[PDB]
């Protein structure tokens, strides 16, 4: 899966910026990465306490938001070739629970990525 390198890089960056992100975000994001429409990987980005954490599999507690999309579509979002809001409205990106939290996540992580 192409997305594995991205989740690992998010975990490495959270070592440095995690405390500041956690204050601004305050939530737990679960990711179901599909291939052949079948779940090829699950990840959690826990931005709720400490320096935050990225780990494999479902949230240890409740996830605020769950996003489901293909490995390819996830990579296209990360490469700026697919707008995440456009993918959502076209039905390529599924988001459950608190949908707008994940758009907050998008904005904050884009800000830090520019530093």
Spatial separation of the C-alpha atoms in residues 21 and 37, rounded to whole Å: 31
Q: How many Å apart are CA 2 and CA 6, to the nearest integer? A: 8
Q: Quote the CA–CA distance of 66 and 64 in Å, as a whole number.
A: 7
- Give the residues across from 39 on adjacent strands: 34
d(CA 76, CA 33): 13
To the question of whether residue 106 is assigned a binding role by annotation, the answer is no
Q: Structural domain of residue 6, as residue ranges?
A: 1-115
Q: Contact, 73 vs 93, CB < 8 A?
A: yes
CA 105 to CA 23: how far, in whole Å? 12
Q: How many domains does the chain have?
A: 1
Return d(Cα 7, Cα 5) in angstroms, integer: 6
> DSSP E strands: which ranges in the chain?
27-35, 38-47, 53-56, 65-70, 94-97
Separation of alpha carbons 67 and 35, rounded Å? 14
Candidates 81, 101, 82; CA nearest to 90 is: 82
Give me the sign of the Cα torsion angle 104, 74, 62, 100.
positive
103 is in an annotated binding site: yes
């Amino acid at each position: 899966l192409q997305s594995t390198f991205v989740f690992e890089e998010i975990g490495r960056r959270l070592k440095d910026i995690g405390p500041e992100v956690v204050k601004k975000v305050n939530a737990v994001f679960e990711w179901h990465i599909t291939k052949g429409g079948n779940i090829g990987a699950k990840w959690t980005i826990d931005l709720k306490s400490g320096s935050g954490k990225v780990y494999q599999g479902p949230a240890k507690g409740a996830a605020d938001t769950t996003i489901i999309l293909s490995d390819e579509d996830f990579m296209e979002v990360c490469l700026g070739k697919l707008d995440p809001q456009k993918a959502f409205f076209s039905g390529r990106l599924k988001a459950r629970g608190n949908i707008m939290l994940s758009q907050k996540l998008q904005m904050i992580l884009k800000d830090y990525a520019k530093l």
